[PDB]
Amino acid sequence: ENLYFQGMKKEKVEQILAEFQLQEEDLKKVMRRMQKEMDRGLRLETHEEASVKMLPTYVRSTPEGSEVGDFLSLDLGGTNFRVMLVKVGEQWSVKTKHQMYSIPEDAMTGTAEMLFDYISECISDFLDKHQMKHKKLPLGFTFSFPVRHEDIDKGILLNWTKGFKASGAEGNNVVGLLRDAIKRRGDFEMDVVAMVNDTVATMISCYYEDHQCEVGMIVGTGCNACYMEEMQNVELVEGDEGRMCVNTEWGAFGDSGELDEFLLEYDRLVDESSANPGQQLYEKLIGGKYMGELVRLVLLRLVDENLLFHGEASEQLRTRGAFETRFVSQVESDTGDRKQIYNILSTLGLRPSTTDCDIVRRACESVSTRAAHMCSAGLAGVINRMRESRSEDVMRITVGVDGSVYKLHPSFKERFHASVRRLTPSCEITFIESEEGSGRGAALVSAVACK
Ligand SMILES: Cn1ccnc1Sc1cc(C(=O)Nc2nccs2)c(N)cc1F
Ligand SMILES: OC[C@H]1O[C@H](O)[C@H](O)[C@@H](O)[C@@H]1O
């Protein structure tokens, strides 16, 4: 106890955690570099070298004329595969039935055949629970990975992200993989009419409640954004009229060195232990796949410096992935009595003091604040770019957001919004959380696409 020595340990911790700070000027630098890469990704000349791919989605404004009725929506992009029946009407969208399926490890890191076979199995199971596999529903596929589109319903997987590794997928038409798997099962038929990124689905789902929503952002397992770009700026697609949603794939920012001065030892460790070393470096500063692991490595450093847990780390603390991102949220939700923090740490086989709990909270805050601030630089770059491309002095825009980090973290949202606003003078940015965004957004796109 000896409060003096507790205080001294906390001072040393603060000196270590100071490394996570980003000054406003740092964020502006990141924002500018992001904007520079966004410009590069949109240009024919530089697209292939661009770290931020700015992928055209073939989701066009505004548009005109939607089909109505029942749509099946799929969502692949986390550990769970989701199937949803959505009714589209008048255009509104309502989730009518839904099921989530845990993807077996063997299917996420096995072959694309196994993965898409499992997907097809789940679709079959869902269509049977609700008596509908003979009805032919138009199908919208939210597929939350970088895809080079040829059209709304055709595009090649560029590379897996977020730990996905299924062989025989990269370079192939993802809709083709899905269609092939459905055919290889042969107990239901579906017209796959659209494939969209989760950012895009999120953005679209927010549109009907707020027509000013022209940005979608995900801060979940991964982190990405899309936005409505002027067709004249989308050099990768023919035509200069109207707007098309662009999937930034900003998670890959830094993959060509753009973040190097900001990457810490912890970031290097996360990256090197990941399924995609050297890739998705910006996302690895922010996404929930990585945030808890960053905290875990910070704690291990503090343990190594004899600042935490008597310098002894439990088996669990030394287990990859054991500090779940949800624990970061839960730690930062602690009311001050250290109870939630104590429970997490005790469950991790630790015997934490009050000071240990306080230090863990600081580590969590340091990592999640950096995530919020880094993320803000990306969103600010996008919004500032849109303002510039457009013809009003104050841009009022809405950003639709989904993802467990943004939605569930007690403080990320607040820090993120504040930082975005500091970075976006002359913008008025409304943030809306999507409600069943993937499923409803995919259906809404499908309801236009299936014409
Ligand atoms: C976000 N915003 C604002 C104005 N236009 C847009 S984008 C948008 C696009 C679609 C849409 O389905 N567009 C398609 N383009 C090609 C096939 S479907 C939609 N169904 C709803 C939308 F809001
Ligand atoms: O799920 C959020 C994001 O995760 C990753 O960054 C994927 O590459 C991207 O496509 C997706 O939007």
For residue 304, give both structure tokens: 């190594």
Task: Decide if 376 contacts 420 (C-beta within 8 A).
Answer: yes
198 is known to lie in a ligand binding site: yes
Instruction: Please give the Cα distance from 451 to 15 (Å, whole number).
Output: 60
Specify the CATH number of the domain 1-56+209-435. Answer: 3.40.367.20
| Closest ligand relative to 66 C-alpha | 1
For residue 55, give both structure tokens: 């992928």
Task: Decide if 315 contacts 30 (C-beta within 8 A).
Answer: no
Of all protein residues, whose CA lies closest to atom 20 belonging to ligand 1? 445
Q: Would you please indicate which residues are annotated as catalytic (active-site) residues?
A: 162, 198
> Taking the chain, what is the end-to-end CA distance rounded to the nearest angstrom?
70
Instruction: Please give the Cα distance from 47 to 359 (Å, whole number).
Output: 44
Of all protein residues, whose CA lies closest to atom 10 belonging to ligand 1? 445
Does 62 contact ligand 1 (Cβ within 6 A)? yes
Q: Measured in whole angstroms, how far is the alpha carbon of residue 417 from the centre of its chain?
A: 17
Task: Decide if 68 contacts 89 (C-beta within 8 A).
Answer: yes
Q: Pick the atom of ligand 1 nearest to 58's CA.
A: 16
62 Cα–ligand 1 center, Å: 5
Burial class (CB in 10 A: 0-12, 13-18, 19+), 336: exposed
Instruction: Please give the Cα distance from 229 to 236 (Å, whole number).
Output: 12
Q: Pick the atom of ligand 1 nearest to 214's CA.
A: 1
Does 204 contact ligand 1 (Cβ within 6 A)? yes
For residue 167, give both structure tokens: 């062989």
341 Cα–ligand 2 center, Å: 30
> Structure solved using which method?
X-ray
Instruction: Please give the Cα distance from 263 to 266 (Å, whole number).
Output: 8
Q: Are strands 191-196 and 213-219 parallel, antiparallel or unpaired?
A: unpaired
Q: Where in the chain is the domain with CATH 3.30.420.40?
A: 57-208+436-448
CATH class of the domain at 57-208+436-448: alpha beta
76 is known to lie in a ligand binding site: yes
Instruction: Please give the Cα distance from 184 to 296 (Å, whole number).
Output: 43
Task: Please name the residue that has the structure tokens 């000349």.
Answer: 45
Q: Where in the chain is the domain with CATH 3.40.367.20?
A: 1-56+209-435
Residue 357: partners with Cβ closer than 8 Å, 6 or more residues away: 334, 338, 341, 342, 345
Considering all CA atoms of the chain, what is the largest pairwise distance in Å, rounded to the nearest integer?
73
Instruction: Please give the Cα distance from 386 to 122 (Å, whole number).
Output: 39
408 is known to lie in a ligand binding site: yes
| Resolution of the coordinates, Å | 1.5
Q: To test ligand 2's pocket by mutation, which of 52, 59, 224 has the most ligand atoms within 8 angstroms of CB?
A: 224
Question: How many residues are there in the chain?
Answer: 451
Residue among 234, 154, 255, 250 nearest 196 (CA): 154
Instruction: Please give the Cα distance from 14 to 416 (Å, whole number).
Output: 22
Residue among 21, 41, 31 nearest 424 (CA): 31
173 is known to lie in a ligand binding site: no
100: Cα within 13 Å, side-chain hemisphere = 8
Residue among 220, 262, 256 nearest 374 (CA): 262
Residue among 360, 375, 367, 161 nearest 264 (CA): 367
